[PDB]
RNA sequence: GCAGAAGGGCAAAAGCUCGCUUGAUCUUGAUUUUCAGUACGAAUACAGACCGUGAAAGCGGGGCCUCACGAUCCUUCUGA
RNA sequence: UUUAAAUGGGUAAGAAGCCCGGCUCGCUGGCGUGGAGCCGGGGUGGAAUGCGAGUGCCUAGUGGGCCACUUUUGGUAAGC
RNA sequence: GAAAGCCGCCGUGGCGCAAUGAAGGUGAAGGCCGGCGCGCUCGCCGGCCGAGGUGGGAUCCCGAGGCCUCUCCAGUCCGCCGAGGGGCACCACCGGCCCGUCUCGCCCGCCGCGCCGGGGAGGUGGAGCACGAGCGCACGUGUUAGGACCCGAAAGAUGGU
RNA sequence: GCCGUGUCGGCGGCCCGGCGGAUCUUUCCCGCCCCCGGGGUCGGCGGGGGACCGUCCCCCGGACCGGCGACCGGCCGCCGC
RNA sequence: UCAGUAACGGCGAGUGAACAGGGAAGAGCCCAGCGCCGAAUCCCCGCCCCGCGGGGCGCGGGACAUGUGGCGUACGGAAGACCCGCUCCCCGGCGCCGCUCGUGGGGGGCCCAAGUCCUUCUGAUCGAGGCCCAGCCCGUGGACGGUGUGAGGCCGGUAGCGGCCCCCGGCGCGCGCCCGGGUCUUCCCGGAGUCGGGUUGCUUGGGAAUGCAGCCCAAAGCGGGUGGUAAACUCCAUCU
């Protein structure tokens, strides 16, 4: 009993299976390039704000450190990833001691 | 055609049809819709009530494809088909009912209107008004929705 | 300057428009120019078809037009794969290929594939010399003609259903009504709030 | 005397004291007044609601009446 | 200002009326009430004199006026 | 011949046939008979039809009666026809119906019983309905915008000698 | 000889007819899905015919006018040479 | 066409798009990188292979270049290892013949028919005339000049009319290039002071910033961009 508009809209058809195209996969971690970047964090060093952010992240505040990232990196969807990947680098040192 | 018009007819009369006194100059009352608020107020109104201000909500980038519902009301419904059938589907045997789908004719909605004749009908449309389908379910007809 | 009952007007003439006018005093003289650009191109190439390659079958993408069928751009790139022809011989066979196209339903897939496996069946090619690698005999005894017009396999052929005559059954003349559309709207816009009250049911514990 | 400018109106009163009191409330229209026969404003009779008063019929949607005020855009607050 | 002229203004001088008979009604309500409404039936000559009237459309020109008896306002008075 | 002719599985498309609403959206038929559930102002059912009624309304139809060398025997006719019937277009009114809000109210429906749909009766708002009249083309008139009936400045601006 | 309009018939040319028809037929004919090397029409789908109508083509038969649709003979009454 | 619409605007005057849809046209690709091939690459100089109107592939010198030349590769994937059944090419020049759709293009040079009688005049191209073929030619009655008004007096027009002179694309020997496809298995997979964000100006219909720029802070890998009302979460789509 199909219908014009609602939850089950319009013409019900068969959803043909298909492989995803090759440009749809643009940003997987691709381990060799992961090795290049994780080689380069410990030779090139860290950004001057994040060397200040990780002395904020542990003892000054825990919320204000993201708001400190929220103003220097663009938005809140870009500020959570920077906040939690520092807290893993700062967990890759603190817990490997 | 320059013969039939007035500037041959009014060639010799000195003021040429615009007064000795007003003596039509260039733009006496402002150009275009000038002064709809102030001095052409009585003329902007009475003849255009509603002209000044907001009335509704904005809809940024409306697309003229999704408000698209061309509407047949039932008195144009038998003339989508060949009339060779509506006499044929009226032969006294049974409920030999033909389909009449408006969506292969360019219509999406069946609106109500009285005076449908007494043959049994099935109608494929995407939208029905509740006056319209009771005008079909009273002639022994059915109302099959599809999209 | 406005007078008795009339129309308020906004003509777009305050901008200087007497320089950007485009008279069409040559619109005959271009039609007799671009027929010569076809007639000295229809005979110029070949008994290969004019009016371009074989174009796909494509359904129009809006609520307004999704009941009709349009000639499109190219076989998407798995029709070349289902019919089993290489993707870079397809445009020198004479089939048009659109690379970036999706397909997500078999209901519109097979109407291209049925066309595409039928095209090559109604096709003949020419040999260099008749060694004929994958070609049969002389092409139909010199192919009966030379060239087609305005589409090889008539790209619209918009086809329709019959449903010749039925019998009203019981349910069919009862259910599928106006109230089968209202609550379809009254639920699909109230789908989220009613699950939000079905989030509150848990915290009553 | 009726708050105030005049004119009109008023005596078991529209005045003067007394007793309650919120009809200076919500609501859709019609009409009158300057009128082009527009609008603001003011006013008139009504109708549906809730009330006040009175024992009652009633009267009362501001001042006894003729003036006391103000569009579009914008801002603000409230109402389902 | 008690009185109150002449001229002036409104209305009326019939069938769109009048009468009788009967049905609706949630209005009104001692009361086949009151009042509207509708249906059917009965009788055209209802002051003078003159004349063919009704209704819709589009829109030009005009928006600087002056003079005369008569009644008047400013002004001493004026072709003010 | 920059003409003319044809296309129609070239009607895509314009404008019209469907209005209202801010918007989600909704989207124009009553009549007559009979039978009924407290016929209870509410309401339920089949049937015949079918665009409702009132007052005017050109025209058309019936038309008592009359009208010819003598009175009684009949035919197509004609002309004057009193009264009466059907009533176009339209004009005024009353009703109905569609949509927007508001007062009052009870009922039903189930892709699944809910701050769910549907309906009713009153009163208003609408560029609506009530058997559609539009599109194309040409011409005239008028209004606007374009140097816009012709002529006219003191200026202003860029770029230069 | 004629042509109009309605009545049809010879279905006469339909299977060697014109155009048209979202009228018809799952015993007709191809490319397939549904079910267990096949099949069940088991529901069809993309496609072809042939049946019915709706309008046009001859026959004989009918009507009515022989009409600007024209000739035949015969008649009256003209006309030149 | 959508459209004078959505939108913008002392929401005044005014300005004002796009997506669908229909047609003309229709053509797609490469490189960096990632990894492999003993730089397998290019330039120049000189000599001769040997030919026009000149450049090639030979050979030896010199320079580039390892901070990366050339081959295969490009996001629809690609490589590599298979394994299976196919198949062995194209392209340039060289000489030409055989063509060429208005029959490729240019150039020069030619192609029918009355001045016959009479008449008028400064002068005819005027007016009249031509046996049973209607005097003559007509695929040639466009035009211009000729002492005035001409199918026939002369250039020319008509004609898949002609003859010439040069140039125009596509047969055919000598060169140069020269294994593609599918199936399964492993491997590789991308452009940074840029995107975004803030603030300021210009602009646009773009309205809580459409475009673009300055300045500052400055990215990420299940990442990033967009989805037309700013922000947070979640889901889905699409592109790189
Ligand atoms: Mg005038
Ligand atoms: Mg004037
Ligand atoms: Mg200056």
Swiss-Prot record, chain A:
Pfam families: Ribosomal_L36e (PF01158). GO terms for cellular component: cytoplasm; cytosol; cytosolic large ribosomal subunit; cytosolic ribosome; membrane; nucleolus; synapse. One of its GO terms (molecular function) is RNA binding. Its main location: cytoplasm. The modification N6-acetyllysine is found at residue 58. GO terms for biological process: cytoplasmic translation; translation. PROSITE patterns: RIBOSOMAL_L36E. Gene3D superfamilies: 60S ribosomal protein L36 (1.10.10.1760). It is found in: Cytoplasm, Cytosol; Cytoplasm. Keywords: Acetylation, Cytoplasm, Ribonucleoprotein, Ribosomal protein. It comes from the Eukaryota. Component of the large ribosomal subunit. Component of the large ribosomal subunit. The ribosome is a large ribonucleoprotein complex responsible for the synthesis of proteins in the cell. Belongs to the eukaryotic ribosomal protein eL36 family. PANTHER family: 60S RIBOSOMAL PROTEIN L36 (PTHR10114). This is Large ribosomal subunit protein eL36. It comes from Homo sapiens.
Swiss-Prot record, chain B:
Residues 1-37 are annotated as: Disordered. It is found in: Cytoplasm. InterPro entries: Rbsml_uL15_N (IPR027386), Ribosomal_uL15 (IPR030878), Ribosomal_uL15/eL18 (IPR021131), Ribosomal_uL15/eL18_sf (IPR036227), Ribosomal_uL15_CS (IPR001196). Keywords: Acetylation, Cytoplasm, Hydroxylation, Phosphoprotein, Ribonucleoprotein, Ribosomal protein. SUPFAM superfamilies: Ribosomal proteins L15p and L18e (SSF52080). Residues 1-29 have a biased composition (Basic residues). The keyword Ribonucleoprotein applies. The modification (3S)-3-hydroxyhistidine is found at residue 38. PROSITE patterns: RIBOSOMAL_L15. Hydroxylated on His-38 by MINA. GO terms for biological process: cytoplasmic translation; translation. GO terms for molecular function: RNA binding; structural constituent of ribosome. GO terms for cellular component: cytoplasm; cytosol; cytosolic large ribosomal subunit; cytosolic ribosome; endoplasmic reticulum; membrane; nucleoplasm; synapse. Belongs to the universal ribosomal protein uL15 family. Component of the large ribosomal subunit. The ribosome is a large ribonucleoprotein complex responsible for the synthesis of proteins in the cell. Component of the large ribosomal subunit. This is Large ribosomal subunit protein uL15. It comes from Homo sapiens.
From Swiss-Prot, chain C:
GO terms for molecular function: RNA binding; structural constituent of ribosome. InterPro entries: Ribosomal_eL13 (IPR001380), Ribosomal_eL13_CS (IPR018256). Pfam families: Ribosomal_L13e. PROSITE patterns: RIBOSOMAL_L13E. There is a cross-link at residues 122, 144, 173, 176 (Glycyl lysine isopeptide (Lys-Gly) (interchain with G-Cter in SUMO2)). The modification N6-acetyllysine is found at residues 15, 176. There is a cross-link at residue 173 (Glycyl lysine isopeptide (Lys-Gly) (interchain with G-Cter in SUMO1)). The keyword Ubl conjugation applies. Keywords: Acetylation, Cytoplasm, Disease variant, Dwarfism, Isopeptide bond, Phosphoprotein, Ribonucleoprotein, Ribosomal protein, Ubl conjugation. GO terms for cellular component: cytoplasm; cytosol; cytosolic large ribosomal subunit; cytosolic ribosome; endoplasmic reticulum; membrane; nucleolus; nucleus. Belongs to the eukaryotic ribosomal protein eL13 family. It is linked to Spondyloepimetaphyseal dysplasia, Isidor-Toutain type: An autosomal dominant bone disease characterized by early postnatal growth deficiency, severe short stature, genu varum, platyspondyly and severe epiphyseal and metaphyseal changes in the lower limbs. Component of the 60S large ribosomal subunit (LSU). This is Large ribosomal subunit protein eL13.
């Amino acid at each position: 009993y199909p219908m014009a508009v609602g939850l089950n809209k319009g013409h019900k058809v068969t959803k043909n299976v298909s492989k995803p195209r090759h440009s749809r996969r643009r940003g997987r971690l691709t381990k060799h390039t992961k090795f290049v970047r994780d080689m380069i964090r410990e030779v090139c060093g860290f950004a001057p704000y994040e060397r200040r952010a990780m002395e904020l992240l542990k003892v000054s505040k825990d919320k204000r450190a993201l708001k400190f990232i929220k103003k220097r990196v663009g938005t809140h969807i870009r500020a959570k990833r920077k906040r939690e990947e520092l807290s893993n680098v700062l967990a890759a040192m603190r817990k490997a001691a | 055609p320059s013969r039939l018009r007035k500037t041959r007819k009014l060639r010799g009369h000195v003021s040429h049809g615009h007064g000795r006194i007003g003596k039509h100059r260039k733009h006496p009352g402002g150009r275009g819709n000038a002064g709809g608020l102030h001095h052409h107020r009585i003329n902007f109104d009475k003849y255009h009530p509603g002209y000044f201000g907001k009335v509704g909500m904005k809809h940024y980038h409306l697309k003229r494809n999704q408000s698209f519902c061309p509407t047949v009301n039932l008195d144009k419904l038998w003339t989508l088909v060949s009339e060779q059938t509506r006499v044929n589907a009226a032969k006294n045997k049974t409920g030999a009912a033909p389909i009449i789908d408006v969506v292969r004719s360019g219509y999406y909605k069946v609106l109500g209107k009285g005076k449908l004749p007494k043959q049994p009908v099935i109608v494929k449309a995407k939208f029905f008004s509740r006056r319209a389908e009771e005008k079909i379910k009273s002639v022994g007809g059915a109302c099959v929705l599809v999209a | 300057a406005p007078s008795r009952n009339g129309m308020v007007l906004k003509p777009h003439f305050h901008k200087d428009w007497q320089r950007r006018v485009a008279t069409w005093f040559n619109q005959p003289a271009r039609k007799i120019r671009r027929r010569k650009a076809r007639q000295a191109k229809a005979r110029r190439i070949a008994p290969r078809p004019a009016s371009g390659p074989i174009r796909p079958i494509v359904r129009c993408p809006t609520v307004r037009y999704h009941t009709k069928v349009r000639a499109g751009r190219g076989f998407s790139l798995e029709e070349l794969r289902v019919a089993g022809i290489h993707k870079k011989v397809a445009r020198t066979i004479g089939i048009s290929v659109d690379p970036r196209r999706r397909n997500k339903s078999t209901e519109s897939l097979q109407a291209n594939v049925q066309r595409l496996k039928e095209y090559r069946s109604k096709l003949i090619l020419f040999p260099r010399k008749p060694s004929a690698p994958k070609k049969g005999d002389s092409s139909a005894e010199e192919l009966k003609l030379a060239t087609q017009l305005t589409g090889p396999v008539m790209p619209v052929r918009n086809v329709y259903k019959k449903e010749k005559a039925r019998v009203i059954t019981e349910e069919e003349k009862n259910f599928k009504a106006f109230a089968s559309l209202r609550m379809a709207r009254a639920n699909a816009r109230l789908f989220g709030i009613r699950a939000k009250r079905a989030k509150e049911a848990a915290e009553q514990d």
